Design a binder for this molecule. Structure first.
Ligand SMILES: NCc1c[nH]c2nc(N)[nH]c(=O)c12
Ligand SMILES: [Mg+2]
Lengths: 79, 103, 1337
RNA sequence: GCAGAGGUUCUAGCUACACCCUCUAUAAAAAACUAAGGACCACACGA
DNA sequence: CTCTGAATCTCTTCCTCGTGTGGTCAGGACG
DNA sequence: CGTCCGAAGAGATTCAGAG
């Protein structure tokens, strides 16, 4: 569990931006069927998203690339 | 502590559609007043402030929706427009001042 | 959805469009039927069905009938929300004026008609006739005519004379009025008019008329032909008070208005007598007046339990008013209150939450988790399971409580720290537990304090809470870069007991392997906590950036300090723990930990500190006892000596040697001295009293007395409280403010006498009442500061503005009140900071000053640093991120989008509770004395006497810094030369403040030019001098003939040839004011620089801060010279002392109507610069801004506010005041229109005029000239462009009327009206959304 | 309510945002679906 | 001699939340 | 059975005596 977000603010400088990027990843993790890249240590989706930012697995640019890749995958599914 | 302890998840609302009636006797929620609003305002809190203002206080659709979303397991907030603001609009319009939300 | 909110005056056709029906009948409903009346105030046909999807007849029900109006009911079936959605209107038989436009501060309808208001309410309330369209008659169309005069005019003139009464008469007048013709007429009149008061009135009228011209509004629309009626859900009148189902409210006012309208209609139909018709029209007009605004009429409709009936405007405005009542603050779901409990076992990030409270707060989350688990097949089953409270429900609660942060809010949220999120932990007790360290941050106690607990719901909300709201994030207070989680009461005492030294204790002199061995010895009890031992300490040094270098050394420290060293992380040095570790010490320790290590190590360190402190305080067994209190043995002797002295003074008073006032002063002085001696003796017998045998001779050591431990450690209670406890309480002032002659000589340990207790209770009750009004005024000031500074967010990373305020340590001469290190910390430099050594750039042009940079400046002793300020940045509707500097709470440059304005408003407002509502130049240490702006001429003795009154004596030490700075007045004797080292403790200047000597330019004899003894200013014997003196008489003092001649002291040779003042052809003549003592007679020589004549000679609390922020004009503002020039008297104080100031290059002389009584600080013939003080008094901030730059007034107001705060011991960074200043001067008056669209006689936002100036500069057009205008926080908030934001602050009526008349359109974009709208605010996490929305345009 | 009609239940339950099922003239076989009227004023107390 | 600054006369606010107690109109016949 | 019957601070408002 992340009780301190200081490492995540190092990864995203704005800190307020860190809430927004984490929210998009967390929404993808909960409402969408998206696997948590970070291992889940009995953690809620919001904490997993913060952990992913601290890991560097997820960043605002990385989330955008993954969303674009999903859009391309949808076109492949359309065939 | 028995008298002073109080809480509500959902409960009866007033005519102004402020969902918490207020007070312990009625099943009412604590007033998130101007000082509290400025406190969250000084913080970077915007999403929490928006949620508390709209979906937790006065939204005929949002309060019903949010409940369905939470019981569905997803925490998505529909902003909508506070009912108290529509009350203000209709009251000022009744006073004789044309107040309207132009696009 | 919508992009902008538009407000404008509504037309009658527009009202008809909103309405779905006309309310003909007054009674709202038939109570027995509980059914809306067909034409009643509540009508199903007019507004909507009372029961959703049910017709009044009931023929049409639910679906398949939805949307279809059954003829018999007459009501369309629709959702019941349509009741509040659909509005109605009431036809008015007589058009009736809108009171808001009728009665206001500038009287909109009166201003349009150029008519006095009194005439307006006379004609509206049918007291006289306005003669509209006089025509061939002598009377003009706008005049007002008396009733009997109206009849006389009827006799004189018939069809041509058409005087009329009532609101419809005023409506006809406005219809006859033409906007554009009167606009050009007003412009021509303004061009012709040369009276600035008449010009001001004409400008007001032309602004109003132009507002009507541009906006789609008609003057006749002000009179309401049709009056809209509120929807019925909004005024339900459904209280169901035990079947009564009735209450007195706005519905009664609507009933009264409808009744009056029906009576007037039937009277008109019946052709009632004209007097009765006009009386009925008066009644209807008064009813509508009270309905729109009760109390504007001056008579309040009453009958609701004999209390004033609330009007629609009253619901609209004030704390009772909905915008303050609900829109600004909305009650929230998922919220609860309970009393507070300590529970130290909790970590800092987490808190204690009652099991039962959590089940109610997280009930929807519990229902969802149960459904996902499948334990509850349906949501109704889940509801039943929660009521059952089975073990499964409690396990589900644990899962939801695990990572959903809960906001904890103190009842008065003065600062952002008041609401901090925490990770909830289930507890058996029914009381919320708050982690002890953060209790100080909340300013809350455990005296039954109650915290509201709210549960954020969304993933955005939870992430926002964990990222920012959580207590671990807010280590440092936003106001000052200091830890706000500083340990407060018990842990500090425990550490102080731990981190203490004893001369002799068991285990002393031992050698210990490490802190672990120290802990093991202490638990074994072989060595006490506070015995000194020689133990090695392995301290890691962060000298290598990011690398820890281990150093192990033997250090002579106490066992307790060794034990605490385990708690400290590796990075911190061991020197910090080696001290006593009181409260300031532990605060510095936490600050150093945050600065050197990361925030997470700091959080762990703070939690470990709290745990260790509590444990070792409990093990310590600190206890307060009567024997613990020490009463000095010298106290009774000192009191007896003081009483003997008092008796001696009483004998002197009886002998008549000393007056009553002097005797009272002497008694106060001797009692104060006795109190000080008692306090000193008590300290001597308390702080070091213990004498302990030390392996040999007994050795005095710092005393371990528990009360002294509490006082010295700073845990709770200062030395003053202890002095009141064990020493004599001392002089207690009676409630007015005067000190009682007899103090309280009895300490709290001894029994207090009844009279002593009464005297004490005087001040106690005074303090309690003053604290209550402190809280009230602090709340008001905080609200005003928030409202004025709400619309401030960081919008640009770097403006690049080279301009900035000059930052220097403030020195009053006694000491350096504010070191430069604290003031410029976390502030980005305005320019490159060169070394005192020339051409050596120590600090670059734009660099944020962290601790390293501030220390580096200190080593090179850079006394003055010019730094960026929020006023300096050129961003419009925003502030430069670099200009604001450090966040002051997260220890780095402010992040983009954070709302600094609300932060600063809360930071300033919060200490207001603590704030109390109610010569010889001594040099401290050797240094170079420096004089600036000094005009001094050596006297006969050669000592320097200075004509300039703006000169200051700032001493510069060897490092180049200004150690001390002093001020010397007109004609101030200077003992020591300028620019040379002066020994510490000597008197640099020795002027007499009472006298005002005037120096002599040229050595010679005086001559009587207009100073002739015979006319006036005759010689008056001076007993003290022993020589008669030709004192100059003041204008009232002298005769009329003396007033005409202005004295001028000519200096001549022995023969009589006039000796000219150096550098000027005119002879040296000194213009002597009244009461100036001219000791030397005619033909008496005066040496150069000698005195030719001698002229004999504020709130400190929250009201002072309120005055400073309001920029209120002082009672006797100090006059400042508009431009550099020569001074002279236009008048001999005739009516008003007239002063001419004309420059040599500037032909136009500034003219001032100086009051006669006010002393003239400037010499009458003196030549002064711009902004120089002319009359002694408090400087007016408006004048300061007009004369000096914005930077200078900023420094002035910041210095004054800080000095008020510095007195109370609370520290606030200057940027917090600076942003409030920037909001205060947001509005800027335009000096000249130039090529700009704005008229020169207008006031617009400085941001908008700046943008217009940039636009005009970009192309080939003349730039606009603007004068910065200081506005009070109340005025600045009221004058904001966002009319919703202004209406939120205060005075909703005037703001709404001004917006409606001008047709103002708020484009949202303000931090507050977004709160009212409820959408995303442009705060930190909403700034991205707002900028994306703006670019989507 | 596939449209019309009826509906187990777990108040009431084709709209409140609603939703689903079976059936062919009218009710009866079945599980999954969802939040309620509170106005004003005084007194007192607690922060 | 017609407007000075000055005296005067209304207008608006005067924390911020709890918790308990209470008391309450319009407007009665009337065909 | 509807149905009518203080305090304080500040901005207008005079107003006015004076250059
Ligand atoms: N609200 C619809 C309704 C009433 N009764 C019901 N019975 C069942 N089985 N299903 C339903 O959907 C309904
Ligand atoms: Mg308390």
């Amino acid at each position: 569990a992340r009780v301190t977000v200081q490492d995540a603010v190092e990864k995203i400088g704005n800190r307020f931006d860190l809430v927004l990027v984490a929210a998009r990843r967390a929404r993808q993790m909960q409402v969408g069927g998206k696997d948590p890249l970070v291992p889940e240590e009995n953690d809620k989706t919001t904490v997993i998203a913060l952990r992913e930012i601290e890991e560097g697995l997820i960043n605002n640019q990385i989330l955008d690339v993954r969303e674009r890749q999903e859009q391309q995958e949808q076109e492949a599914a359309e065939l | 502590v028995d008298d002073k302890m109080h809480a509500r998840s959902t409960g009866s609302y007033s005519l102004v559609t402020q969902q918490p009636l207020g007070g312990k006797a009625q099943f009412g929620g604590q007033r998130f007043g101007e000082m509290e609003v400025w406190a969250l305002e000084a913080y970077g809190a915007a999403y929490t402030l928006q949620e508390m203002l709209t979906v937790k206080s006065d939204d005929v659709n949002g309060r019903t929706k949010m409940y369905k979303n939470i019981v569905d397991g997803n925490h998505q907030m529909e902003p909508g427009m506070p009912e108290s603001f529509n009350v203000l609009l209709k009251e000022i319009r009744s006073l004789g001042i044309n107040i309207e939300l132009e696009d | 959805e919508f992009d902008a909110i538009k407000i404008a005056l509504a037309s009658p056709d527009m009202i008809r469009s909103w309405s779905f029906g006309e309310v003909k009948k007054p009674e709202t409903i038939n109570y027995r039927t509980f059914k809306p009346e067909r034409d009643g105030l509540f009508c199903a046909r007019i507004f909507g069905p009372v029961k959703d999807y049910e017709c009044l007849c009931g023929k049409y029900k639910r679906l398949k009938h939805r949307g279809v109006i059954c003829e018999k009911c007459g009501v369309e079936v629709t959702q019941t929300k349509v009741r509040r959605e659909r509005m109605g209107h009431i036809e008015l038989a007589s058009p009736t004026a809108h009171i808001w436009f009728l009665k206001s501060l500038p009287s909109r309808i009166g201003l349009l008609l150029d008519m006095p208001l009194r005439d307006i309410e006379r004609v509206l309330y049918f007291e006289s006739y306005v003669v509209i369209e006089g025509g061939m008659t002598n009377l003009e169309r706008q005049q007002i005519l008396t009733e009997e005069q109206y009849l006389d005019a009827l006799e004189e003139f018939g069809d041509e004379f058409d005087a009329k009464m009532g609101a419809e008469a005023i409506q006809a007048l406005l219809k006859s009025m033409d906007l554009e013709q009167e606009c050009e007429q007003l412009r021509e009149e303004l061009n012709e008019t040369n009276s600035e008061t008449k010009r001001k009135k004409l400008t007001k009228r032309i602004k109003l008329l132009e507002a009507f011209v541009q906006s789609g509004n008609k003057p006749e629309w002000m009179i309401l032909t049709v009056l809209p009626v509120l929807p019925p859900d909004l005024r339900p009148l459904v209280p169901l008070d035990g079947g009564r189902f009735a209450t007195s409210d706005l519905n009664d006012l609507y009933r009264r208005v409808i009744n009056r309208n029906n009576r007037l209609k039937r009277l008109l139909d019946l052709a009632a007598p004209d007097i009765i018709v006009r009386n009925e029209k008066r009644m209807l007009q008064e009813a509508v007046d009270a309905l729109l605004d009760n109390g504007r009429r001056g008579r309040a409709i009453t009958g609701s339990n004999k209390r004033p009936l609330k009007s629609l405007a009253d619901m609209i405005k004030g704390k009772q008013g909905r915008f303050r009542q609900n829109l600004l603050g909305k009650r929230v779901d998922y919220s609860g209150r309970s009393v507070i409990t300590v529970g130290p076992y909790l970590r800092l990030h987490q808190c204690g939450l009652p099991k039962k409270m959590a089940l109610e707060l997280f009930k929807p989350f519990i229902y969802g988790k149960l459904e996902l688990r499948g334990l509850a097949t349906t949501i109704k089953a889940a509801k039943k399971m929660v009521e059952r409270e089975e073990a499964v429900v409690w396990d589900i609660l644990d899962e939801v409580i695990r990572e959903h942060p809960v906001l904890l809010n103190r009842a008065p949220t003065l600062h952002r720290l008041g609401i901090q999120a925490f990770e909830p932990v289930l507890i058996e007790g029914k009381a919320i537990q708050l982690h002890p360290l953060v209790c100080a941050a909340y300013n809350a106690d455990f005296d039954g304090d109650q915290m509201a607990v709210h549960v954020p719901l969304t993933l955005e909300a939870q992430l926002e809470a964990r990222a920012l709201m959580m207590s671990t994030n807010n280590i440092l207070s936003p106001a000052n870069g200091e830890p706000i989680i500083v340990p407060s009461q018990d842990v500090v005492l425990g550490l102080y007991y731990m981190t203490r030294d004893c001369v002799n204790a068991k285990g002393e002199g031992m050698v210990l392997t490490g802190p672990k061995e120290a802990e093991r010895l202490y638990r074994s009890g072989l060595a006490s906590l506070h015995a000194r031992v020689k133990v090695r300490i392995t301290e890691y040094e962060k000298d290598a950036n990011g690398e820890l270098v281990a150093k192990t050394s033997l250090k002579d420290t106490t066992v307790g300090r060794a034990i605490l060293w385990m708690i400290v992380p590796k990075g911190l040095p061991y020197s910090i723990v080696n001290q006593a570790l009181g409260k300031k010490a532990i605060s510095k320790m936490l600050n150093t930990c945050y600065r050197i290590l990361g925030l997470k190590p700091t959080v762990i360190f703070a939690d470990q500190i709290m745990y260790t402190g509590f444990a070792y305080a409990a093990r310590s067994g600190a206890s307060v006892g009567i024997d613990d209190m020490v009463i000095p043995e010298k106290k009774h002797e000192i009191i007896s000596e003081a009483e003997a002295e008092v008796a001696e003074i009483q004998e002197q008073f009886q002998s008549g040697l000393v007056t009553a006032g002097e005797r009272y002063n002497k008694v106060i002085d001797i009692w104060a001295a006795a109190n000080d001696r008692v306090s000193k003796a008590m300290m001597d017998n308390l702080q070091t009293e213990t004498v302990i045998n030390r392996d040999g001779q007994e050795e005095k050591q710092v005393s371990f007395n528990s009360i002294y431990m509490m006082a010295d450690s700073g845990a709770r209670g200062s030395a003053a409280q202890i002095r009141q406890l064990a020493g004599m309480r001392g002089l207690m002032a009676k409630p007015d403010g005067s000190i009682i002659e007899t103090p309280i000589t009895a300490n709290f340990r001894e029994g207090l006498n009844v009279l002593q207790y009464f005297i004490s209770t005087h001040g106690a009750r005074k303090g309690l009442a003053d604290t209550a009004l402190k809280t009230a005024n602090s709340g008001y000031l905080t609200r005003r500061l928030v409202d004025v500074a709400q619309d401030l967010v960081v919008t640009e990373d770097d403006c690049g503005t080279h301009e900035g305020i000059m930052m220097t340590p403030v020195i009053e001469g006694g000491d350096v009140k504010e070191p430069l290190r604290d003031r410029v910390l976390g502030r980005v430099t305005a320019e490159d900071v060169l070394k005192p050594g020339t051409a050596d750039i120590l600090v670059p042009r734009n660099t944020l000053l962290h601790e390293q940079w501030c220390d580096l400046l200190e080593e090179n002793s850079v006394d003055a640093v010019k730094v960026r300020s929020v006023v300096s940045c050129d961003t419009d509707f925003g502030v430069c991120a670099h200009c604001y500097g450090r966040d002051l709470a997260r220890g780095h440059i402010i992040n983009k989008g954070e709302a600094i304005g609300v932060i600063a408003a809360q930071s300033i407002g919060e200490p207001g509770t603590q704030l109390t509502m109610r010569s010889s130049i001594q040099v401290k240490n050797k240094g170079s004395i420096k004089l600036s702006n000094v005009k001094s001429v050596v006297n006969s003795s050669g000592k320097l006497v200075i004509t300039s009154r703006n000169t200051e004596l700032k001493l510069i030490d060897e490092f180049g810094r200004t150690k001390e700075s002093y001020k010397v007045p007109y004609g101030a004797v200077l003992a020591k030369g300028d620019g040379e080292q002066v020994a510490g403790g000597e008197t640099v200047a020795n002027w007499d403040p009472h006298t005002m000597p005037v120096i002599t330019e040229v050595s010679g004899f005086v001559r009587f030019t207009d100073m002739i003894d015979g006319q006036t200013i005759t010689r008056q014997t001076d007993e003290l001098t022993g020589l008669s003196s030709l004192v100059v008489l003041d204008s009232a003092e002298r005769t009329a003939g003396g007033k005409d001649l202005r004295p001028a002291l000519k200096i001549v040779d022995a023969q009589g040839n006039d000796v000219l003042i150096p550098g000027t052809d005119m002879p040296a003549q000194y213009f002597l004011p009244g009461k100036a003592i001219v000791q030397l007679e005619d033909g008496v020589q005066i040496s150069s620089g000698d005195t030719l004549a001698r002229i004999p000679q504020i709130t400190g609390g929250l009201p002072r801060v309120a005055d400073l922020f309001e920029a209120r004009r002082p009672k006797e503002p100090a006059i400042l010279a508009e431009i550099s020039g020569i001074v002279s008297f236009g008048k001999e104080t005739k009516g008003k002392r007239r002063l001419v100031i004309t420059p040599v290059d500037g032909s136009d002389p500034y003219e001032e109507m100086i009051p006669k009584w006010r002393q003239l600080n400037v010499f009458e013939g003196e030549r002064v610069e711009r902004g120089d003080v002319i009359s002694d008094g408090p400087e007016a901030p408006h004048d300061i801004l007009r004369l000096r730059g914005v930077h200078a007034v900023t420094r002035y107001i910041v210095n004054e506010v800080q000095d008020v705060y510095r007195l109370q011991g609370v520290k606030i960074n200057d940027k917090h005041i600076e942003v409030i200043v920037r909001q205060m001067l947001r509005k800027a008056t335009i000096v000249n229109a130039g090529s700009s669209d704005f008229l020169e006689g207008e006031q617009v936002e400085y941001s908008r005029v700046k943008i217009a100036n940039r636009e005009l500069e970009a192309n080939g057009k003349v730039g606009a000239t603007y004068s910065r205008d200081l506005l009070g926080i109340t005025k600045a908030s009221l004058a904001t462009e966002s009319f919703i934001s202004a209406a939120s602050f205060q005075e909703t009526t005037r703001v709404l009327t001004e917006a409606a008349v001008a047709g103002k359109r708020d484009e949202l974009r303000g931090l507050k009206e977004n709160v009212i709208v409820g959408r995303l605010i442009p705060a930190g996490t909403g700034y991205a959304y707002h900028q994306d929305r703006m670019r989507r345009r």
